[PDB]
Each structure stands twice: as C-alpha cells, then as structure tokens.
Design a binder for these strands. Sequence first.
RNA 1: UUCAUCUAGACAGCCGGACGGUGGCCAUGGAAGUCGGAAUCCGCUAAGGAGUGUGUAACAACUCACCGGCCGAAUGAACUA
Lengths: 51, 147, 234, 132, 128
Amino acid sequence: IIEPSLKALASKYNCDKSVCRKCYARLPPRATNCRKRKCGHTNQLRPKKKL
Amino acid sequence: XXXXXXXXXXXXXXXXXXXXXXXXXXXXXXXXXXXXXXXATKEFKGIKVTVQLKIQNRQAAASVVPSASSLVITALKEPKNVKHSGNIQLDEIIXXXXXXXXXXXXXXXXXXXXXXXXXXXXXXXXXXXXXXXXXXXXXXXXXXXXX
Amino acid sequence: MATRTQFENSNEIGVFSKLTNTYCLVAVGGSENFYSAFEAELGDAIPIVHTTIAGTRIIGRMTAGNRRGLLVPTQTTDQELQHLRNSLPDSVKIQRVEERLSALGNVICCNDYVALVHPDIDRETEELISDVLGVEVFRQTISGNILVGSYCSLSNQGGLVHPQTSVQDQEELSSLLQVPLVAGTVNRGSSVVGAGMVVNDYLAVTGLDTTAPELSVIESIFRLQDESISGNLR
Amino acid sequence: AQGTKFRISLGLPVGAIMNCADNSGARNLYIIAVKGSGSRLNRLPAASLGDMVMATVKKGKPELRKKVMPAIVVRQAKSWRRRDGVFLYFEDNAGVIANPKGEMKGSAITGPVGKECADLWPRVASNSGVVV
Amino acid sequence: SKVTAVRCKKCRTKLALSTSFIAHDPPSKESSEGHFIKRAANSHRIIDIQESQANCSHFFIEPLKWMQPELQGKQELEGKFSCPGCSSKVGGYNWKGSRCSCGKWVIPAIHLQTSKVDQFPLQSTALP
RNA sequence: UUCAUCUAGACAGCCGGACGGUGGCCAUGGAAGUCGGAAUCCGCUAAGGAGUGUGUAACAACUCACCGGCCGAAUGAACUA
C-alpha cells in the first residue's frame, strides 16, 4: 500500500542521513564535518540507524 | 481479452505459497490453481525443484516446464540437508539432455551447448567418477551429431 | 436485537436512556456515536426524544414509565414538562408525582403488565401508579436490596435479576411476575443489572464492555434472537 | 477519572470526620486527601460535594479498618450556590466508599444525595434512592 | 457439534458461518516459529525474544459473498474491511502472512480479529 | 615541511555496455548475485565477479567491479604552528 518506489522517494529525506556523535544533529550522508558551531566542526560522524 | 504470463517454482506434490500472492490481481481460485500446477509436476518428485510458467485467461489452466535451468539434470536421477552429491553416467544421456536444453542456448552447435549444461551440474557424479571440471572439460563425442 | 454502545465514555446506558415499546428518551449531552446506535435500529417506528429531567442527564434513573404512561419527579421544571407533551404522542399520559423518594427509576421496576416498587412507598403513590400506568402494583424486594430499579431489569418476555440472589427467592418472584428469571451479570461483571442495560421486545442495548458469554444470557431469556447474503464466492 | 464539575464552595478540609452513607459496614470516614487538589504553602486541601477523596474507616467493621481506600462525598453542610439561584445546604456530611475506577461497593444509600454528585458519577445515581 | 455463526458486535451482522475456518490449531513451539524474533539492520542481529500467546486471536476464513465488492473494487496486496453497517476496523485482508497471536503462518489469507467480534451458536439456546 | 599521481590525458563529473546457461544448488512462510554455509563452473566477449552496495514480503530498480570513448591542468595523502 506504500508503493516502494515512493518509499525510496521518502527515505532520502528521512532515513538516508547521518548523525554527529557529539551534538546529535541530522547531517547529509556524504558529509565530512558537522555544520554547527557548538560541537567545534568535528569529524566524528555515524550513519543514521536503519529500521 | 488479454494474456497474462506468470511464473512458479519449487514444489513436489502441492505447493501454495508464492503463487497465491500473484493470484491476488487475478481471479480468486485456490483449488483450481493448486490442482492445475499438480498436473504439471505429475511424475516429478516433491523433493526436487520444479519451475513452471502459467498463462491464464478467465480462470484458465496452463502447464509447461521450460527445462532451461537445472531442471534437466535433476530429472535424470533417482530420489537436515539432502546432499545432491550423486554419481550419474551423464556423457551418454547429457548429449541428448542438452538437445532438450539447447533450444536457443544461443551458441555455436551442441559442442558448446553441452559444456554449459554440465557446468550447471555442479553436484552429481555424472559419467564415471566425476562429471565436472577437467573430467567434463573437453568433449570428443557427438559434436557434429546434433548439428 | 443485541446492540452495544456507550455514552460519553461510560458503559452504563440505563442511567442515560429509557426505552419502552412506544417511545424512547435520551440525554442531551451526547455524541453522534451514541444517538446513531438508537436511531439506525429503531428507525422512525418510535419517537426518540432528546430531553433532560430536573436539570440533569440521569433521566433513566429519574423517570419511570411504560407503553401507556410516564412519571416524572417533582423537581422537573414546567419547561421540561411541556416539552415532553409535544414530542411524545397523545397515547402516553404524563403526570408529575409528589414524592420523598424522588428517583423514580430506582424505585419503580415496571413493564406493561406487573410493577414492583420500593417497599417504603406510600399509599398515595400506589393509587396513582395503578391509575396512570394501569398496572397492578406489588411491593417486593430482591433478596438483599430495597432498590428494585437498578437490580432488576424487566420486560414482557422475561427478566434479568441481581447476581447474588438465592434460588427460592427467584422462584417466589417468578410466580409473582409470571416471567422466567435468570440471575446474571452485565458489563464484564457489574452486579447492577437494571442500569447496565435497557430492554424492550425488539431491542436490548447494553454496554461495550459486556463480554461475549454475558450477551448470550441476555438475549436468551428475553428471546429476541431468531441470512442469504452470506455465502462463498471463490 | 473525574468529569467536569462547576465550582462549589470547599467545606471539608483534611481531618474532617464525616458520616458514612451506605451499608458497607463502616460508620465514619476520615478524609486525608482530595483527588485533583492544588498546591500552596500552608494551604490545606479541601473537599466539596462530588469530589473523590482518600478516606479511612475509624469506626465500623474490623475488616475495613487500618487501610486507605477512595471515597465520594454525597452530602455537605457548608452552603453552596447553584446556578439557578438558590443557596442550599444539607444537615450533615456524608461519604460512600468506592474503588479508584469509581464503582461503588455499597448496595444502597440512606438519606438524600446531592444532585451535582449524581450527575458526575453514574454508579452513585444507581444506588441513590433520593436525589435532593 | 452444531453450526455456529460469528456475528459482529455493534453491527449485529453474521459475518461468517461455520463450514469455514482453516483453524491451523497447533503452533510449532520451537525457537524459529513459535517465538517472535526482532532482527536488526545488519548481520542477523537479534535484539528481542518474545513468547507466543495462548490462543490464536484471528480467524482464517474463505473470501465470502459480502467481501466481493471490496476485493474487486481497487484490488490491492494488503488492506482492511468493515462491517456493512458501522464501518469499523473489523478484520484485514493480507496476501503475505500475519501468523496468529500465538503464531504459525498461514497462507495468503483473510484474518479476522477476535476482538470486537464474537461467536454465537446458530442452533437453539443453551438452556442452563 | 615530507612523499605521491599527471599532456605516454590524472582526481572530479558526464555520456555508453554491464549479457547468456539463471529464479544454479542444498536452506525456509517466503531468500532470483545482496537473511546465510561450503562450494566458485561455463558460454558469448572490447568487457561484465554464481556479485560491491541501495532497495523488495520475494522480484524489480540502480550502482560498483569491469570494458570503451567525452571534457584537458592540476591533484591525493600525512603532518608542523
């Protein structure tokens, strides 16, 4: 009922991201540093957990 | 009207798993479907895998076995994990078993079309001891028999 | 037949409605989900009246009536009294009753034929109940209780009574009421059986938390139960 | 668990020994708190007609005593204002005991019950013989 | 025994008779099918183990006569349906699975939840 | 500061192909290169791994590997303060 062509359209905005370890922000999946200033532009990133 | 081509796999006696899901968009039939596929796998084992394709129109039955895959070399044998490591005398019958197999194989004659069907046979004993690798590498029989 | 619904979030319906064979009363502060349960299954055969009694919403416990009449307590204002004269038909008769025991639903347990009232009721009321409702009036108590309204649901077919009730007291009641009586529970085990449900011949509405074996006992004694649309098309 | 009730005057602070209206064996109830009351420095929480309170038995059957159980006020001696206009008040305070869902253990209530208590609780209105 | 009917609560409609009921009664009780397994994203990592319930909380019946317009009109691979008079979530249709609360598997089947529906005997009364 | 790639055409990006015996085989509700174990073969080929990942109830769909051209001078890495 979800039509998984539309699910891959939706997962790019919600699932296919990355998360900074220090400040928990939501970052694009090919990013190298966090865009915020409060964590000091760190390079400790992880993939966002899948379901 | 229209023609609707579908597919089916596995099963021995009666199988009702993957097939019932594709019959959702089609008409509702349970006893009509699993009995029509039963005549296709008639005189075939329930241990073995059987691949079929069924084209139907308004509750219709179709039964055909294409035998392009390993369905052939499974058939010329006798019936926690059943090993298929058996010995069969293929080289006499696999010359004729390739003839049913090579309907389009799309290769130059049966000299290269029997060297692929034996390559699919990656389990059984075949001819003499082994019917694989270097034991079934170079053929010196048939070749210009089928073509 | 055997419908279940609930007012705002309360399972008990007999506090909030009064069902007879010729009319029906409902409280005014309801959702559309509660009123649709009555209106769909009754239709336009009997008039369904949104009303209040004495400025309250507990009209199932403040009123008492049957096919021929309806009794209202003293604190019912004349705006609410003149309203009920218009919506109900001319066959019913409404008369206000001067009581010390104001809640007429818990006091009077009645149907078309035989009425049971509270034992502490006076002679002036008993002459009026047999006048308006046209019913012979018997003063009798369920075995351990003096309130016969909340602990005895009655209809023309049969009657459900209080669960903790001795057998020989049911048999003396059954000879008096001339209907067969079953002791049981309603609404997942509530001992209050008069207020847990409403009942007449064609319909009997109970709470949503009434379980499946409880609904079988209710429809069997009241005998409301009795189909080509079902079938297999494979 | 409590529905909407118009505000009436608070007449039963903590420690009030009120009568017991039903025939569940108890004779008096000792109010120790009120469900849904507020918070203020040195303010005692108080009950009103129709509130759910926590109350203990000080006199009655020996099974009921020495434990806390919820209860519902049904009469009140402090006068309150009704919206139609009249100021009324009963003769003495009274309370029936119930489970925390609101169903009543008693079989019947002697004496009258306040009208705003009867509309707020359905099971109280079933057991009530006289409603004001 | 006798014939029974599964009437809808709050709709009062005979949804299903007997001569039905693919009841599938015994579960498996073993560690792969009698238990509920919750995996993870990678490398078959099992985070939760759940025990199956006692009684199977569905009903596995035939596609019936009143189910015909919902199954033809906008036919899909999964969904639900209702009583014909109250439009409540009564039971869903699934061409996948949904074993039982208690577990086996079934077939592509028509599950009907035992909540908000009850089972009456179509024969005479119990007469206690 | 110390290495390394590059007009003998880089990194990045674009445009093409990515097939045939294939849903191979045991395995199970269902696993088609992608829930997993050992195997790992052949044919057509310039070249395409019984498959690097994303995805699917299972497919599909797509990328990487791989094979060709398009644009045409800078580029990748480790560290010092």
